[PDB]
Structure formats: structure tokens, C-alpha cells
DNA sequence: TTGTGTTTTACGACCTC
DNA sequence: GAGGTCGTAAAACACAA
């Protein structure tokens, strides 16, 4: 768990994550571990962010 | 500045596998 | 039991009023 109470991710951190997301919708356990390490976040955070991004996409698509 | 509507992290519940 | 969606909180944001 990750607590007090949410962090803002840097413009760079977001950029990499968007790029990776365009590379593939679902991140591999390997990739997850690369990305976390290069971006200065946790594996869990990277997991979660990818889950939120997919929900955002579903939400934009419904609209 | 603050009211407000939208986005962004992060969770817990339940589901699938 | 790892991850998944999905509904939700609250903090951060945009920015017109």
C-alpha cells in the first residue's frame, strides 16, 4: 500500500507511461519491473496506473 | 480568490483465471 | 492468491465568475 494520500506524477513519468501504454494495453510483469525502476515509482503504482488508464479509456469511449 | 466541474492517484469488493 | 474491472474518495487541477 501507498499512503498519504495521493502523489502527483511528473510530466516525464506520465510521458513514459503513455508511450509504454501505446506499445501495449497490458503491461508484462517484466516490463512493469523495468518501467518502475526507470521511473522511480513502485511496481504496484505502475500496475495501478495502467488499470486506471484502461478505465479512463472505457469512460471516454462510452461518452 | 472561491465555486465548480473534471481529472488524477489509490483504495477495497467482488470476479476470473 | 496473483491480477482484473468498476465504483468511489479526495487531492490536484483548470479557470470563469
From Swiss-Prot:
- Location in the cell: Nucleus
Bias (Basic residues) occurs at 55-63
The entry's note on the tissues where this protein occurs is: Intestinal epithelium.
Where do the segments described as Interaction with 5-mCpG DNA lie? Answer: 44-55
What domain of life does the native source organism fall in? Eukaryota
Residue ranges, annotated region (Interaction with DNA): 5-26
DNA-binding region ranges:
2-61
Question: Briefly, what is this protein's role?
Answer: Plays a role in transcriptional regulation. Involved in activated KRAS-mediated transcriptional activation of PRKD1 in colorectal cancer (CRC) cells. Binds to the PRKD1 promoter in colorectal cancer (CRC) cells. Could play a role in the terminal differentiation of the intestine. Binds preferentially to methylated DNA.
Task: Give the family this protein belongs to, as stated in its UniProt record.
Answer: Belongs to the Caudal homeobox family.
Q: Which named protein is this?
A: Homeobox protein CDX-1
The organism of origin for this protein? Homo sapiens
User: What does UniProt list as this organism's lineage?
Assistant: Eukaryota, Metazoa, Chordata, Craniata, Vertebrata
- Gene symbol of the encoding locus: CDX1
Residues included from the entire protein: 153 to 215 of 265
